[PDB]
Amino acid sequence: AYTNSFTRGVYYPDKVFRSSVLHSTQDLFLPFFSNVTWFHAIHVDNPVLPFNDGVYFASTEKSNIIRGWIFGTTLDSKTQSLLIVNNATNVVIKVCEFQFCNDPFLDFRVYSSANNCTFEYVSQPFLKNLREFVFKNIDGYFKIYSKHTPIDLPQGFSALEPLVDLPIGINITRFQTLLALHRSYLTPGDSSSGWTAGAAAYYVGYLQPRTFLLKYNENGTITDAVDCALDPLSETKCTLKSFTVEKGIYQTSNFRVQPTESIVRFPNITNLCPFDEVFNATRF
């Protein structure tokens, strides 16, 4: 399916305090008014989604049906995959190349092959309520941002806060989600029948390198943002560094049609030398 993402997905990028000032930053953000894929949490099991550059995962649920994620280059134990599993008591983060089943097990508490853990971590748990998360992995660290808010996605503006900065350096390229259910059967492989579950859904969006104009209030919190490359008026705002532009004409930028093809051109070159005479010689 599809649904436009409103002014959402912005997060605190640098953990530096600023008061009553505007700041422009070039980083991986979620473009405004872009459509995002929509999936439902009933039953089947769940497809793998590539991890292009960063994923914005929002979820509106009221039964704790979605409980974790798994990242890595493959579900088999051939590579150091990653595991993140929430629970009512705490989070368990693991990096051990544990081979997974054809489908992630539906919580019968765990289903994976042997492990060779190299990093492990634990802390308090991440818990109609719209929970939002941003996952990023660029500089050898894997970073999580989050926010849980009262309440389709609302038009209200709200930024995500830095949650954890992990040091694991695994090459993450694909990702999946983990579901659960009460008194549900569990098998390594199952059809699209699934098991009954509460009404829930989860959305997915892809981050892109963008220039954002962030507005900090007197308390150091982001209250507004402008996508510098959304429409001409927003781009005009980015040059003046001001949310209000006066009457006039402004030279914002320049455009240039890009090359559509590449060609190589060399002469009729034809003068091969005699290898057919030394290999097909008459008499060695």
Ligand X SMILES: CC(=O)N[C@@H]1[C@@H](O)[C@H](O)[C@@H](CO)O[C@H]1O
Which residues lie near ligand X (CB under 6 A)? 73, 77, 97, 114, 116, 171, 173, 217-219
CA distances from 108 to 102, 136, 191 (A): 16, 31, 18
Cβ 2 to ligand X shortest distance, Å:
28
Which of ligand X, another protein, none does residue 27 bind to, with CB < 5 to 8 Å depending on kind? none
Q: Can residue 15 be called a binding residue for another protein (CB under 8 A)?
A: yes
Cα dihedral value 203, 209, 210, 214, nearest 10: 80
Which of another protein, ligand X, none does residue 89 bind to, with CB < 5 to 8 Å depending on kind? none
**Minimum CB distance to another protein smaller for 187 or for 242:** 242
Site string for another protein, 114-153 (x = CB under 8 A): ----------------------------------------
**Minimum CB distance to another protein smaller for 141 or for 250:** 250
Cβ 16 to another protein shortest distance, Å:
5
Contacts of 58 (CB under 8 A, 6+ apart): 8, 36, 130, 131, 132, 133, 153, 202, 203, 205
Grouping H, G, I as helix, E, B as strand and the rest as coil, residue 236 is helix
Q: How far apart are CA 205 and CA 153, in angstroms?
A: 13
**Minimum CB distance to ligand X smaller for 77 or for 239:** 77
Q: Which residues, 153 to 182, sit near another protein by CB under 8 A?
A: 161-162
**Minimum CB distance to ligand X smaller for 4 or for 116:** 116
For 191, phi then psi, to 5°, come to: -80, -170
For tokens 């609302």, the residue is: 154
Cβ 110 to ligand X shortest distance, Å:
15
Site string for another protein, 228-247 (x = CB under 8 A): ---xxx-xx------xxxxx
Cβ 238 to ligand X shortest distance, Å:
22
| Among the listed residues 33, 108, 141, 250, the single contact to another protein using CB under 8 A | 250
Which of ligand X, another protein, none does residue 161 bind to, with CB < 5 to 8 Å depending on kind? another protein
Q: How far apart are CA 61 and CA 203, in angstroms?
A: 11
- Contact of 66 with 131, CB cutoff 8 Å: no
Q: Which residues pair with 29 in a beta bridge?
A: 208
User: How many C-beta atoms lie closer than 10 Å to residue 175's C-beta?
Assistant: 18
Which of ligand X, another protein, none does residue 171 bind to, with CB < 5 to 8 Å depending on kind? ligand X
Q: Point out which span in 36-44, 108-116, 218-226, 276-284 binds another protein (CB under 8 A).
A: 218-226
Which of another protein, ligand X, none does residue 188 bind to, with CB < 5 to 8 Å depending on kind? none
For tokens 């992990």, the residue is: 166
Rg (CA), the chain: 26
Q: How far apart are CA 109 and CA 36, in angstroms?
A: 32
Burial (CB count within 10 angstroms: exposed 0-12, middle 13-18, buried 19+), residue 183: exposed
| Among the listed residues 6, 18, 25, 79, the single contact to another protein using CB under 8 A | 18
